[PDB]
């Protein structure tokens, strides 16, 4: 029980630090909330959460505030440009609260947690307990299962599960939420690993209806180890269409930066195509010679045009004639 002097009487009118933040909880459980808090409560996030940085609102990042501004020339003759800089519309920055508050803790999710330590496992009705008895040499079970099924049958299985997932999200503006209902939603420890009965369960919630022998075949393919965990990011990419796979992924970068790097990789790949076949004699010529101006003479003599735009694409690669022609090889 809680009999220490630190816990207080229910009929206690003295002050307790942080009792105006508790709710729906008895006094002693409230006193447990303040001292040893659970992650869900505000008393936890006010003490043990790192502060999120909002760097644009910091007055320190603006260096003109440290010194008072000094007057410059405002004579029309003693000038160099006749366009004063246009005032930018000031951004709407009004701080209303600390950014540490992750607000997504629904009431039901807090009131109706799995009310025991072993019930959140959520087993399936049909399951093979012998496989959770950690029997010896799980890899042999994988090999035997895959040799019993045959590889041509998994291709049929993935194809028909593709047809089912294609058939599920018919038309709605919430179809991505149901796609996330496969693995990522009912998931913690965002490392994408799924155990075998959990996989069978998430599959039957959608209607795959996989028997264990076909199930362990998928694992011999997608997990050739004794770990027994599956990387669903590799798997569901085959079931989903590529246009809707992004919805399941949640975040795909469409940045102009990423596009420019995709441009850079395309230019360097084209130039690799260019110097590739003729790379064999360029190294011999360069060793027969290193400066860039000398490299132009070498590259032009051997047969490839090398210009300023070539040097700007090759600037991130080198600076070495040896490693240069090697990465060209």
């Amino acid at each position: 029980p809680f009999t220490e002097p630190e816990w207080k009487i229910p009929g206690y009118t003295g002050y307790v630090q942080g009792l105006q933040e508790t709710y729906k909880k008895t006094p002693v459980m409230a006193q447990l909330e303040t001292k040893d808090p659970s992650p869900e409560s505000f008393i936890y996030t006010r003490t043990q959460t790192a502060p999120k940085p909002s760097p644009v609102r910091d007055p320190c990042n603006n260096p003109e505030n440290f010194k008072k501004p000094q007057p410059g020339n405002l004579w029309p003759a003693l000038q160099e440009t006749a366009i004063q800089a246009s005032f930018k519309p000031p951004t709407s920055n009004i701080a209303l609260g600390d950014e540490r508050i992750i607000p997504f803790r629904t009431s039901y999710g807090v009131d109706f947690k799995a009310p025991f330590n072993g019930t959140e496992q959520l087993r399936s009705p049909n399951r093979n307990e012998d496989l959770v008895k950690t029997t010896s040499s799980l890899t042999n079970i994988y090999k035997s299962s895959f040799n019993r099924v045959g590889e041509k049958r998994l291709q049929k299985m993935i194809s028909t599960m593709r047809e089912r997932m294609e058939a599920k999200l018919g038309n709605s503006n919430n179809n991505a939420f149901r796609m996330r209902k496969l693995f990522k939603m009912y998931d913690n420890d965002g490392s994408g690993r799924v155990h075998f009965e959990d996989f069978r369960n998430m599959a039957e919630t959608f209607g795959m209806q996989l028997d264990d022998d076909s199930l362990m075949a998928l694992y011999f393919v997608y997990d050739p180890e004794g770990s027994g965990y599956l990387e669903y990011e590799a798997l569901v990419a085959q079931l989903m269409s590529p246009s809707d796979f992004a919805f399941y992924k949640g975040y795909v970068d469409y940045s102009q930066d990423k596009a420019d790097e995709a441009r850079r990789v395309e230019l360097l790949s084209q130039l690799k195509k260019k110097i590739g076949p003729v790379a064999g004699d360029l190294e011999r010529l360069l060793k027969a010679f290193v400066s860039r101006h000398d490299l132009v003479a070498g590259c032009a003599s051997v047969g490839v045009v090398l210009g300023d735009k070539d040097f700007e694409t090759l600037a991130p690669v080198m600076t070495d004639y040896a490693a240069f022609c090697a990465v060209f090889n």
Binding site: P55, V56, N61, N62, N65, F66, D253, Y254, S255, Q256
Partner: protein, 146 residues
């Protein structure tokens, strides 16, 4: 402000335009800093001796100052202060160099230009996504005539 006349300290708060803070000129009264915790007596406000209090030799441009529990990180100094430190405390030029308390801000994503639909030409098609009101493209008549 460290007043060499009285060895007192005064912390002025600077204000930014449209800050959320009420304007208050001063942040700490002009009294000598304690620098230590002293067992207070309820009758007599403590008499602080110079040895207990801070000295001009304590600020080292990169250190933390325990100002009443607050830990200010001082990061610059005026030209007169730098000169004074070199003159009187034999500091080197490099110590007086200001340390930069600056943190970066990351740009926004600013999504890329879409790849072109294979109907028009690249140049005539880029305008539709570039601007709202489509403008015809421009040519190098400079090179044309020449």
């Amino acid at each position: 402000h460290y007043y060499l006349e009285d060895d007192s300290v005064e912390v002025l708060e600077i204000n930014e335009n449209n800050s959320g803070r009420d304007p208050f000129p001063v942040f700490l009264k002009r009294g000598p800093l304690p620098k230590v915790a002293v067992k207070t007596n309820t009758t007599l406000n403590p008499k602080f001796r110079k040895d207990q209090c801070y000295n001009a030799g304590d600020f080292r441009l990169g250190l933390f100052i325990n100002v009443l529990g607050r830990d200010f990180y001082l990061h610059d100094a005026d030209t007169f202060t730098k000169q004074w430190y070199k003159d009187n405390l034999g500091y080197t030029d490099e110590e007086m160099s200001p340390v930069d308390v600056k943190e970066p801000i990351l740009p926004k994503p600013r999504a890329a230009v879409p790849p072109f639909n294979g109907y028009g030409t690249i140049e005539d098609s880029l305008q539709n996504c570039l601007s709202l009101v489509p403008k015809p493209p421009k040519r190098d008549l400079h090179k044309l005539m020449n």
